[PDB]
Amino acid sequence: PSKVALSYSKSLKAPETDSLNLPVDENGYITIFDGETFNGWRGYGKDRVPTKWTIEDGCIKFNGSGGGEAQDGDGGDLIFAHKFKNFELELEWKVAKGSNSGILYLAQEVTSKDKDGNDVLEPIYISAPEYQILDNANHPDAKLGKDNNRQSASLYDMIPAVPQNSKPFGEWNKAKIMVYKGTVVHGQNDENVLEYHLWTKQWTDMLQASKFSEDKWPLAFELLNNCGGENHEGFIGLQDHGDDVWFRNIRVKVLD
Ligand code: NA
Hints:
Layout: E1 3-8, E2 18-23, E3 29-31, E4 41-43, E5 53-56, E6 59-62, E7 78-84, E8 87-95, E9 100-107, E10 111-113, E11 119-121, E12 130-134, E13 173-180, E14 183-188, E15 191-197, H1 201-208, H2 218-225, E16 234-238, E17 245-254
This protein binds sodium ion (NA).
PDB class: hydrolase
Keywords: Structural Genomics, Joint Center for Structural Genomics, jcsg, Protein Structure Initiative, PSI-2, hydrolase
Assembly: monomeric
């Protein structure tokens, strides 16, 4: 019955002035999804959970209509609205045949001004590194990128999961994402599959060879190159990429 108070925010860029008492296990993992509600969770940029995210059989499901990045209907990415800094997330994930999703971490909610001075919501992924979720056997993204760097558990389009030990579609996979003092490790199915380091020259060089380079996408470069912003922190998010996917046993340990 041990529990810990985690702060959360309820709307775009809001301060985390509310709180949830969540279970914490014997090793410090706080269960952030309760199996039954979206308490603490909301749409990236919204004050409401988009109804394409549902809850069934103890899992968060996305209900995709097949438009990839479109984020059409009552969609968009989903965040657990508590900023983490040094943390280790563990979860299980399952893809339908041919499905694409992702885990986003260190996400900031970012707006730009258009030519009229209105605020425009920028994509979660121009600030947040992404752990790819994919059916590697059927989604064509599996064959794009370089060295299989768009297969499940890759840092999408930058560093491939090696080993690529995904189970086939319809089976539960385990994911781990660890961020500790700038060292990031992805795990998949109880193995560490890649490692990298934020805020270094080599990270800069990696971004300069990406679709988020300073030349191609200045805002993305600025945000990602100082990932997590001034305080190096941000939201865990789940990706709307138009496809059916399920997540469960979502747990985060705060690291010191
Ligand atoms: Na994805």
